[PDB]
Paper text:
The process is initiated by the [name] core [name] complex, which synthesizes a [2Fe-2S] cluster de novo from cysteine-derived sulfur and ferrous iron (Fe2+). This complex is composed of the iron-sulfur scaffold protein ISCU2, the dimeric pyridoxal phosphate (PLP)-dependent cysteine desulfurase subcomplex [name]-[name]-ACP1, the allosteric regulator frataxin (FXN), and the electron donor [name] ([name]), which is itself reduced by the NADPH-dependent ferredoxin reductase (FDXR). The sulfane sulfur (S0) of the persulfide on ISCU2 is reduced to sulfide (S2-) by [name] to initiate [2Fe-2S] cluster formation. [name] and FXN compete for binding to overlapping sites at the core [name] complex during de novo [2Fe-2S] cluster biosynthesis.
Second, a sample was prepared in exactly the same manner, but was incubated on ice and contained equimolar amounts of FXN and reduced [name] (hence abbreviated (NIAUXF)2). Cysteine was added (‘turnover’ conditions), and the sample was quickly vitrified, resulting in an incubation time of less than 1 min at ≤ 4 °C. This condition allows persulfidation of ISCU2 but only slow [2Fe-2S] cluster synthesis. For the turnover dataset, heterogeneity at the [name] binding site could be separated into three major classes. The major proportion corresponds to [name] bound in the distal conformation (65%) and only 14% of the particles show [name] in the proximal conformation. Additional weak density at this site, typically associated with conformational and/or compositional heterogeneity in cryo-EM, was further assessed by C2 symmetry expansion and focused 3D classification. This revealed two major [name] conformations that we refer to as ‘proximal’ and ‘distal’ according to the distances between the [2Fe-2S] cluster of [name] and the FeS cluster assembly site of ISCU2, namely 23 Å for the distal conformation and 14 Å for the proximal conformation. In the distal conformation, the [2Fe-2S] cluster of [name] is too far for efficient electron transfer to the ISCU2 FeS cluster assembly site (23 Å), whereas the movement to the proximal binding position brings the [2Fe-2S] cluster to a distance of 14 Å that would allow rapid electron transfer for reduction of the Cys138ISCU2 persulfide. When bound in the proximal position, the C terminus of [name] is ordered and well resolved, interacting extensively with the [name] subunit. Contact is mediated by hydrogen bonds (H-bonds) between Asn175FDX2 and Cys-loop Ser385NFS1, a salt bridge between Asp179FDX2 and Arg393NFS1 and hydrophobic interactions of Phe176FDX2 and Val178FDX2 with Leu160NFS1. When [name] is bound in the distal conformation, Cys69ISCU2 is shifted away from the ISCU2 FeS cluster assembly site, whereas it is facing towards the iron, but too far for coordination (3.9 Å) when [name] is bound in the proximal conformation.
Residue numbers in the entry:
A (entry chain D), G (entry chain H): 35 to 157
B (entry chain A): 56 to 455
C (entry chain B), H (entry chain F): 5 to 85
D (entry chain I): 69 to 186
E (entry chain C), I (entry chain G): 3 to 76
F (entry chain E): 56 to 447
């Protein structure tokens, strides 16, 4: 395993849940198509529009868990439009994912988009 | 510090007695066993025949019925392809199961590409085939029936004697893949009515790169050779016989024949300990395969709501295996777990534990404690576990 | 033959706790104990002599394998800490 | 910018598909209900997007890269007109191209299993 | 304490709950141990208190008192 | 007391450095190289990649072009049968020589039984093929040309570079059986235009039961796998890769690369010593092959009017080999000796001497002394010698 | 490499030749069909029709040389009629010849018969 | 470094003369002699250090192989008489 | 005796005809030998006359007379 994936797996960042019934909380629950990987990503957006909290729960491999932790710690501090500019290519390049583990970065990007879309739908 | 080894199904450590037997032929007796004119060849040939007798004595066969190969993969290829090609003029149908090893399955697929007809028998939820289904699947042009003795992934045991009785009654050659069974459970080719058997050296604490295939001589079973050459091994397997490797294989067979009863009792006790300790501390843990016809040395457990490779990564101090698709080089799901009727999510949650000759109670307890702690953590991280606690019942997930 | 058997058993244990590898060391020690207690009640002197000769052969094998493993040694297991 | 390509499945059905310039063979076949696995999803890791290319258009495709070749080494029933479907991009010179699905892939499905579309 | 460690060793090697191992109890009669068990007890005493007991003294070591006297002497 | 081993052609003794490299993986590192989730598998795989790089560095190839097998027999089977079966739809003709190893010949004979056409090229009296003959034998539907680099019976070398040039000009795949040439003579796959090469472990002082085959990747050469399974070794050979054996093969390749020049000079000196001392004392002794294109480590001599196996039995304290039909389990004469044009009574009189890395001048002198004595005795016993003395 | 073959090869009996011009000497020179083994066998008979001396010269394998020397010592001391009863099976049984080595005993029997026939033809 | 090279050469020769096998003993002695003679006029200290390190590794390999061959020893060759 | 064994060994180890080995002949100046050859001569002397020459004494051994004196004394 890569040392960065090992670090994000052994010390996962922002693991938890948020009140999904809140007006200012978007929930994205996605699943990988070719494997059983499942990611649940949630965000908290303040009155400014800047993400102040992110948290994930992931059923999947260590690469998927690392991708979810990294995706949470990346959209933390950004805005909606900036969070929309986060690509699975960026996640995979940062984590040095081999070609068989790119589904993890794809699922992380899908979960970010799903959470953002849910927040936009309720707002 | 090195991790504990609990992956004996993949391979086993070399037995010190086997290495002690091998070393003289790696140092001083380096002659070619097929050299007929000098003492190096004579002594190499004598050692090879001694090893052949040891293997035959282990499996209850005649020494002349043993052919040395490079492994159980080559043994399975030789058996299946040679029988099918030799009896091609009249027999064009083959029978095997859906839970067979990749070598057997790929040989059957390549034969299908060659114009043969292959029936993949389904298995029950216990992992055991149905004898009525096998009898109904036998055709007048059936050539070979291939059923493995012990499954390498779930460890279930097939009714080899009854299958052999049926095949003998129907005049069909019976082949069994006993790579996971030789030296671990009793085997008798004559009592079980077995025509062909596959043996792997490194599954019985012998050296890697060596194997054997049993071919019945009365009534004679014929195969068409796959490796062409000088006609060594009675013409079924050409090439130079690796004398140190075959000596090690024979020594491993003798050691297994001497230690089988003690090893089985010790492994049964250890497996019972591990299974009860895991089940009494972790809820929602199921065992894949029926315990009543299970070899205790191969334990497959599904840890619900925890992914297999994530659990393997958490257990970095224990060498294990998993059936998850994320552990495969081509994202291949576990076809054995699919065949036995496991759900996809539970199949992604399977862990294989291996208990062998050198496993200790200390290692078993350490593995159990680590498993309990890390499964609890990963379930606390699990959205599926949270969903089941809430009651959503996993109905709706965006799979994109 | 009691003294000879007890000396052979002591030598076998002493040599077996010299294995560099955890698996080989533990297996050899436990196997020697189990076998010696298994053959505690044998009465036939020919059978006793056969067992003693087998034990001598196994002790020679153990000596050779222990020294070879010491020559090619690796790190320790995690549980050995 | 319309490209017409024919898909031939395992049973021999001739499926006509109206593609577009710049389209991907795997995505197009999965959109039109063609049972092409494509497990890795164009990640050059599974080689289950294996397809047979008609001889009249095989020479018209960009020559395969070293990674595509390495990955084709793992595909069963390999032929001289073998390509990875995830690496083929539709172009106007591929009019009437026919892609034949092999009988088996790298992943074992001897029970007749059909993976859900990816 | 040396004799405390000797008694701990004997209790661990004999499974006697660390209560009946006194300064006059024998390994064979008072406690449950045969010749093979005694060989192991002597080797474990050698393991803990680093020494190489000769056979002459090893045959003499039959009681907890004998083992304690030998260890305190050497 | 044991006899002297001069039979390096049949098999070589294990090199002590090869055994020293192997032992750690026979003792501590016993994991499966194809295990993908634990340290045992990772370290075994790292060792196997190291060995692959070692073999590739020896033969001047890329590591990804090396496939580990169980020996040169399996390597030859894979090359010939896989190439022929992969290019069946258009190429149905194979070319090989009349003095090839039995594995190559039997693969060609089994392919003939499969509906292929095989041409067996004859050799001159020197044991070397004719390039004009090969050029004329190449057809538009020719799949593969197989010529061994060094003959295992007479030790003659073939013009491998010229054959590779011809094959690339004619757009035909070139396979060479180098099981007697690796680590003994310089080999370069890119400079000899070689598409497939066979390598044997126990012929280069490595362990038995292991081998390798080189398959050119640029331009890509495809083969059809003969061993089905889980698709290891890039899908070209299934089954578990034996880690101790492949580490041993790689170590042997490294040692051969480091020692080839020393070994060649020493073997050459020992070879002329042996040949000159035999030919200066025994009349009517001829060499089988051509000295100008000869590897000195394989010496095949014919002792007129003396039978080969009788000479071998007289040489009880030297381990040698013969081409006589009485040394064969099926009374088979030496087809190589027949092909090179040797008369039958001289083909029944052939002895193959072998000089290797561990051969000594003392052993060479002892063998020469014993050979002279026993050939003199058997010639005194020979009725053919008597008749030749009588001018008949 | 059976002990009797080794003995008879390392200490061959009656190696040499007899005069071919003598009336009481028969020479049999015959060869093997499938191999290059060649035996020459000569016998000496007296007024009473008793074979008193025999010699051999063999170009062939060790088993062929042993068979020829056994044939010579077996033929010495008998008559023509008794020497006509020496079959290859007896030689093979005495030398413990493996199935691949029966040509040696066959060729030795052929040499014996040729020598007797040559002698009686000279008579 | 002369003294170090002379001590290492002496140790290599002494250890190689203890091989139990004729071929290994003779080859090791001849190779050590020939290699030290071939590398006699080297001037680069880096190259000399590399040769010394390689010789140390070779001496370790020789020690292990000599003692293993002593553990597994066979009959002497006919010419050793 | 001994000193003829010494001369004989020096002769077969420096390949010198077995006439230039004199009681005052030096190993490096008179005879033809370098440091590596001297290491071999000392080892051959040790092998013939069973002993273990220390490093200081081996360094002192530079002449046929020195080897003679050492072998006589030891
Ligand atoms: P103690 O109270 O005097 O009693 C102990 C003994 C056994 C000495 C006593 O009960 C006795 O005299 N019994 C008579 C029977 C007897 O002496 N049997 C012992 C035979 S020796 C034996 O058991 C050999 C077992 C083989 C050991 C090899 C283990 C394998 C190791 C290989 C691992 C790599
Ligand atoms: P003297 O004045 O001491 O002269 C001797 C030396 C060589 C020390 C002197 O000539 C000198 O100073 N030369 C300079 C170069 C030098 O020191 N070279 C020596 C380097 S060490 C060397 O050559 C390593 C060779 C390795 C031998 C291993 C071979 C064994 C193979 C294994 C067999 C199984
Ligand atoms: S989809 Fe896996 S390689 Fe093309
Ligand atoms: Fe995954
Ligand atoms: Fe013969």
């Amino acid at each position: 395993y890569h040392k960065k994936v090992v670090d994000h797996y052994e010390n996962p960042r922002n693991v938890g849940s948020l009140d999904k019934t809140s007006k200012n909380v978007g929930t994205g629950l996605v699943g990988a198509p070719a494997c059983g990987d499942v990611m649940k990503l949630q965000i908290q957006v303040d009155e400014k529009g800047k993400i102040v909290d992110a948290r994930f729960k992931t059923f999947g491999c260590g690469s998927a868990i690392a991708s979810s932790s990294l995706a949470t710690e990346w959209v933390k501090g950004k805005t909606v439009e900036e969070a929309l500019t986060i690509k699975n290519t960026d996640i995979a390049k940062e984590l040095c994912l081999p070609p068989v583990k790119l589904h993890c970065s794809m699922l992380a990007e899908d979960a970010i988009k799903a959470a953002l879309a849910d927040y936009k739908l309720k707002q | 510090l090195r991790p504990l080894y609990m992956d004996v199904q993949a391979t086993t450590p070399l037995d010190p007695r086997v290495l002690d037997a091998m070393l003289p032929y790696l140092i001083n007796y380096y002659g070619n066993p097929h050299s007929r004119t000098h003492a190096y060849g004579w002594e190499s040939e004598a050692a090879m025949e001694r090893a052949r007798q040891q293997v035959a004595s282990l499996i209850g066969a005649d020494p002349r019925e043993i052919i040395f190969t490079s492994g159980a993969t080559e043994s399975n290829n030789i058996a299946i392809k040679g029988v099918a090609r030799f009896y091609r003029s009249r027999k064009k149908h083959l029978i095997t199961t859906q839970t067979e090893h990749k070598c057997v399955l790929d040989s059957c697929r390549s034969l299908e590409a060659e114009g043969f007809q292959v029936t993949y028998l389904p298995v029950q939820k216990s992992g055991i085939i149905d004898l009525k289904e096998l009898e109904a699947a036998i055709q007048p042009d059936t050539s070979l029936v291939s059923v493995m003795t012990v499954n390498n992934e779930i460890g279930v045991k097939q009714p080899i004697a009854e299958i052999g009785r049926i095949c003998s009654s129907r005049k069909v050659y019976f082949h069994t893949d006993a790579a996971q069974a030789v030296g671990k459970i009793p085997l008798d080719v004559n009592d079980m009515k077995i025509d062909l058997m596959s043996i792997s050296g490194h599954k019985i604490y012998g050296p890697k790169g060596v194997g054997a295939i049993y071919i019945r001589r009365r009534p004679r079973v014929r195969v068409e050779a796959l490796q062409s050459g000088g006609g060594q091994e009675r013409g079924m397997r050409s090439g130079t016989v690796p004398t140190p490797l075959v000596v090690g294989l024979g020594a491993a067979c003798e050691v297994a024949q001497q230690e089988m009863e003690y090893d089985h009792k010790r492994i049964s006790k250890l497996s019972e300990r591990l299974i009860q300790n895991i089940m009494k501390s972790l809820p929602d843990v199921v065992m894949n395969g029926d315990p009543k016809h299970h070899y205790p040395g191969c334990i497959n457990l599904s840890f619900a709501y925890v992914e297999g490779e994530s659990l393997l990564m958490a257990l970095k101090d224990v060498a294990l295996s998993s059936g998850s698709a994320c552990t495969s080089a081509s994202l291949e799901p576990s076809y054995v777990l699919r065949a036995i009727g496991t759900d996809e999510d539970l199949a992604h949650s399977s862990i294989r534990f291996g208990i062998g000759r050198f496993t200790t109670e200390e290692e078993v307890d350490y593995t159990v404690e680590k498993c309990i702690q890390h499964v609890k953590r990963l379930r606390e991280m699990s959205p599926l576990w949270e969903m089941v606690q809430d009651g959503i019942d996993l109905k709706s997930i965006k799979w994109t | 033959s009691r003294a000879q058997v007890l000396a052979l058993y002591r030598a076998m244990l002493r040599e077996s706790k010299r294995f560099s590898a955890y698996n080989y060391r533990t297996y050899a020690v436990r196997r020697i104990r189990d076998a010696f207690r298994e053959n505690k009640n044998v009465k036939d002197p020919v059978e006793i002599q056969t067992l003693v000769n087998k034990a001598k052969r196994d002790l020679g094998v153990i000596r050779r394998q222990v020294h070879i493993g010491q020559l090619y040694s690796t790190d320790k297991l995690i549980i050995e800490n | 910018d319309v490209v017409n390509v024919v898909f031939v499945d395992r049973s021999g059905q001739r499926i006509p598909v109206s593609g577009r310039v710049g389209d991907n063979v795997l995505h197009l076949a999965q959109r039109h209900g063609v049972d092409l696995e494509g497990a890795c999803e164009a990640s050059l890791a599974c080689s289950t997007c294996h397809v047979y290319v008609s001889e009249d258009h095989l020479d018209l495709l960009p020559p395969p890269e070293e990674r595509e070749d390495d990955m084709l080494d793992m595909a069963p029933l390999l032929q001289e007109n073998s390509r990875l479907g995830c690496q083929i991009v539709l172009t106007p010179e591929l009019e009437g191209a026919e892609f034949t699905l092999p009988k088996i892939t790298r992943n074992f499905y001897v029970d007749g299993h059909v993976p859900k579309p990816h | 304490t040396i004799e405390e460690r000797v008694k701990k060793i004997i209790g661990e090697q004999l499974g006697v709950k660390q209560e009946e191992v006194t300064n006059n109890a024998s390994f064979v009669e008072d406690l449950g141990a045969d010749s093979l068990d005694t060989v192991e007890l002597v080797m474990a005493l050698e393991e803990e208190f680093d020494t190489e007991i000769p056979d002459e003294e090893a045959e003499k070591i039959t009681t907890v008192q004998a083992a304690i006297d030998y260890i305190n002497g050497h």
